[PDB]
Design a binder for this molecule. Sequence first.
Ligand SMILES: Nc1ncnc2c1ncn2[C@@H]1O[C@H](COP(=O)(O)OP(=O)(O)OC[C@H]2O[C@H](O)[C@H](O)[C@@H]2O)[C@@H](O)[C@H]1O
Ligand SMILES: Cc1cc(F)c(Br)cc1NS(=O)(=O)c1ccc(NS(=O)(=O)c2cc(Cl)cc(Cl)c2)cc1C(=O)O
Ligand SMILES: [Zn+2]
Length: 278
Amino acid sequence: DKGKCGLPEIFDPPEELERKVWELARLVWQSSSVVFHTGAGISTASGIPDFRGPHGVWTMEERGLAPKFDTTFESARPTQTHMALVQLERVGLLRFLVSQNVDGLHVRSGFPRDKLAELHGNMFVEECAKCKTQYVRDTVVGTMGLKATGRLCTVACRGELRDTILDWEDSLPDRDLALADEASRNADLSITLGTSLQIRPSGNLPLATKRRGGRLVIVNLQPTKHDRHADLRIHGYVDEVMTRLMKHLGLEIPAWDGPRVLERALPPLPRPPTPKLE
Ligand SMILES: Nc1ncnc2c1ncn2[C@@H]1O[C@H](COP(=O)(O)OP(=O)(O)OC[C@H]2O[C@H](O)[C@H](O)[C@@H]2O)[C@@H](O)[C@H]1O
Ligand SMILES: Cc1cc(F)c(Br)cc1NS(=O)(=O)c1ccc(NS(=O)(=O)c2cc(Cl)cc(Cl)c2)cc1C(=O)O
Ligand SMILES: [Zn+2]
């Protein structure tokens, strides 16, 4: 299944967008455990196509056209949204990040790997079949569907290194899915950014938050499978939403100094005091 492709994009008019991003700031300020869920829509503003948008991989395949890239994976820069998520984690306003993206931009943005579940894998990550050690490379490993890459493990092993890109049939990495599930169940606030939530089980994790009494925010230009469950629904460009959110929180979007891998989150930095809400 390729799900429902080419659904129309909706745009909240300016006054409604500004009110909703203020509401998003309120939910972030008032929640103790925030989880973000990202899909291909947070990388479109860096020149990587989505799957089901108007120019998505599947949408364009139906017209017998190839998807259009404005960059390579290697030369892609993290978006304002990617860098906003880095800062929210650094000041302790983001507990966990669940991504369906294989574009490798969360990792290369400097987002700590111990707070990231990459449910569908990472173009730049190969894993040793023998000892399960991961290598984050500066270039895409070159295979998809958990095939041998031609390189061997160098741990003090010679194990066969395979890509981490799931094929259609393949089940999700157990560690990442277990952590994504635990994080989603424990969150009082799940925020989805640039995902249609059409792929199971990735797309249902934000519901785990709702089922347990937490709130759900969906940010997406197209409608999503779970629109009916959202406490707040924002139809706008994620970069515009996240830059306005960061201005309300009084946080800067940090500079990206090129590809940087952070295995373990650093201690939390200071953040502005919270406004008096109502
Ligand atoms: N800048 C933007 N701002 C907001 N929404 C956007 C933007 N750009 C696109 N969108 C929306 O972003 C949404 C992107 O939805 P989909 O294309 O389904 O991507 P996924 O990540 O959820 O696909 C999941 C898996 O499916 C595959 O099989 C792979 O395994 C993927 O991991 C659309 O609804 C766009 O309207
Ligand atoms: C490889 C890739 C991953 C992405 F996330 C995005 Br966007 C784009 C690409 N490149 S692509 O043109 O769209 C592209 C798309 C599909 C395939 N093969 S596939 O069986 O249909 C497939 C790939 C992936 Cl990552 C996930 C699934 Cl669920 C299925 C190859 C390429 C290519 O590059 O040769
Ligand atoms: Zn090994």
